[PDB]
Symmetry: C5
Subunit: 211 residues, 5 copies
């Protein structure tokens, strides 16, 4: 019973990976939209001697490829599967003002659904450039970090968020810092030199010491 | 001498018949129960400037796969074997509020038995979010961390405990912290990414400065 | 449509990586590498060990005949992105780091049909630097050289497009403000050897933002 | 000087052409262990961790590693990467960080099938150094044994119960008053069979 | 524009040399001479609370294998080439009193000449055992660390130097510590048990705080 559904996975993965492409990333002819959302878990540390703040968050990434589509009927009605994030193409989304390599906190496993969409939610600790003056005041501190593609312009990779409100429903209730607000905003930058636009998601967090 | 080279051939054979001839993980059609217990060894450090605590513990994981069964009679009466944890599927049990990558302290080897059950007991050091306020009081501090599949919902991986008492038999007797109580309890929850409920085992520890 | 433009890229890459007879520069085939620095932040200055930590991007550019193609053969593709591991890259090294350099950005190169490669890794580097005077008006001064580790000026030459370090994305709220930053090609002669070595020297003058 | 070709053939015969799946109940293994303490680098009294630098001498013997030297131009032993052969999963039971390796990981295999493997390491382990700043010093223990094999598959022995102190760093912050290594038979709550360790007990104090 | 033939020759040479098959390292019947020299760049730290000192230096290693020889006439007059150090045998030269794993500061690439000689110069940071007592006086502190093969006696690896003077021509002029002297001395020792000679190079450095 269970054997057969396992052999259909094996054929599906073989068709998709071994007998096919492999996907060389997006182009201007075939652009890709990548949806980003943040779930801020903690501001672990705000260092006023080096102006670095450390955040822990889950970063949800979603995109869709024609090359990852299948008909569930040809594969015993399997509609999705888990795969190592290293066994598929993934987007090169990066913080633009990190000061330390990102530390990955969760397994590197993505889920592929039959419509060709991919879900990947890496949990991470990020140090990034930020001046925390005002954390010990009523109004608090403000920090900002952009995320986007390192090498693709808005012509190959478009970014989007589902909402501009950072998910705060798992924010650690006993953090050294209380969150005043956290937004995530798609921003487009144009240059008079260059025909191609650049997209980033801007993460802005205002916070203060838990009084 | 004769019998020894014999059962070595039998073991090598079995291991060949099991791996080189075929498990892609659980699915809604073929779900898996994993049992989780914790053995707490030491609360090493409590940092109240960042609210992080560092624990050393091991984590007993047990599950059972039909594809890992054999009749001992076909294999020179072999009933179990040790194998590297990279040779088989293992569950993606993740701490949900770690602040740094988990550090592995023990060899990554599991023990497989003829009934297809697997026993895997990695020892680890983990930093996680924990306000240690009260730790210098009779009543002490209370902190909690949850452990669950990152990418499989309760439809795919069920988690259970064998007892809800954390094993204290190896708790370091001269730790800076003594343990008032430690419990491990199954919980459920939705996450904003996903409709399905996800299972976790919540580890709650009340601890106090020794003496 | 999608079928074809994508299949062309796949074919172009297959042709370059699976099908071509580049093992690095030789004396009979030297390479010039253009280097440019963008300084993002001076993170830390430790006057107890004389180490300073910089976050910066390092723009590297070179050009190879073996990466040329005619776009007309490949559906008018003019360039592509690829993993830096798929291609030869040069061993440009800081000569006075005190810790392994930490890579902050993806490792991905852009390759153009004229065969030119561009590669811009962001990095955090701890290097040898006495920050004495960082708390005064005149500021502190430090220097670090970058060049190939194993290739002499007969195999790898370096140039800069400019001697001014790009300060246009320097972190405005850094602990340290930049007084000036220059990048200058140098040649060193030796410690025996007829063949010289080439580096790009980065000189940064800085002080506490007060 | 056909000895190079001979060593390549030997290694090729043992490793490439042959498959040792580790010890079993029907084929148990005895590992001899001995410790050489090089330096107590650090003692942290705010966390109760102590950092030791030491060698862990490991020796065992396999039939599947025997050869006749005469068949191989009289080669009696050779060195090879530890990753080419099976090695025992000897683990400290009370480390607080991953063990860091200080030396190459190269084993010496001898024609009788005996293997000697002596890696150098730095270990942080659980230890209260209270009394380190007094005449009688502090005492701490850490045991080492197979993580996943019981006494029925891996047994341990020592050649002496004296930890070798003859390379101990003479200008260390701490001096050693004693250091012993002793085989133990233990039953853990996890598991029904006995597991063997060697227990290293070290008494030490601040130098002068 | 027949750089192409020079490239073809280089690729053909590397393939003939490597994409061959069986060097098992040295033996008593086949000893290898290895020449060692240090270029001391900086004493970065001297920790008198743990008696560890950290140095940054270049370690030059030279040896020669018959199996790496070729006739340049056969390979478009190529007389040397660069290659990843992972592609060749390298000697197991080690600090005998380090307290942390060495950190590699430079690419790991060797230069191979047609007479079979290899030149390999890794830059490194080393923590080693060292009492920095008197660093704050005119006489200074002294520390010493031996380097040698981990598993090979002087009958298999003959370790040599070209000079006993450490190269200080690159020493950091603004270091916290100024170098009074730095020597590298080959020593040949015999022991109780064993008939084999053992060779080490003793690096002795005398240093003091910059005035
Ligand atoms: C089944 O369709 C929804 C896709 C979600 C399964 C994939 C997923 C991937 N990575 C992380 C996920 O997180 C679920 C909970 C939140 C942390 N673990 C879910
Ligand atoms: C005298 O030796 C001749 C061969 C040298 C080319 C090979 C070499 C290998 N690795 C590092 C090298 O350093 C050159 C300069 C010093 C740092 N860059 C040279
Ligand atoms: C109920 O479990 C019995 C099976 C045990 C063999 C498997 C095992 C796996 N991993 C670690 C083990 O630890 C035994 C001792 C405690 C630390 N080493 C045992």
């Amino acid at each position: 019973d269970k054997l057969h559904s396992q052999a259909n996975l094996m054929r599906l993965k073989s068709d998709l990976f071994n007998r096919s492409p492999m996907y060389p990333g997006p182009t201007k002819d075939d652009p890709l939209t990548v949806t980003l959302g943040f779930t801020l878990q903690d501001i672990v540390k705000a260092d006023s001697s080096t102006n670095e703040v450390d955040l822990v968050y889950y970063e949800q990434q979603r995109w869709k490829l024609n090359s990852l589509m299948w008909d569930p009927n040809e594969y015993g009605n399997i509609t999705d599967f888990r795969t190592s994030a290293a066994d598929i193409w993934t987007p090169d989304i990066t913080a633009y003002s990190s000061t330390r390599p990102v530390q990955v906190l969760s397994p590197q496993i993505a889920v592929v659904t039959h419509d060709g969409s991919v879900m990947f939610i890496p949990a991470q600790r990020l140090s990034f450039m930020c001046d925390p003056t005002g954390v010990d005041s009523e109004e608090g501190a403000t920090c900002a970090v952009k995320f986007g593609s390192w090498v693709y312009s808005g012509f190959e990779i478009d970014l989007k968020t589902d909402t501009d409100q950072v998910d705060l429903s798992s924010y650690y209730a006993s953090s050294k810092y209380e969150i005043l607000s956290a937004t995530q905003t798609r921003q487009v930058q144009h240059y008079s030199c260059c025909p191609e636009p650049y997209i980033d998601v801007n993460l802005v967090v205002k916070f203060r010491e838990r009084r």
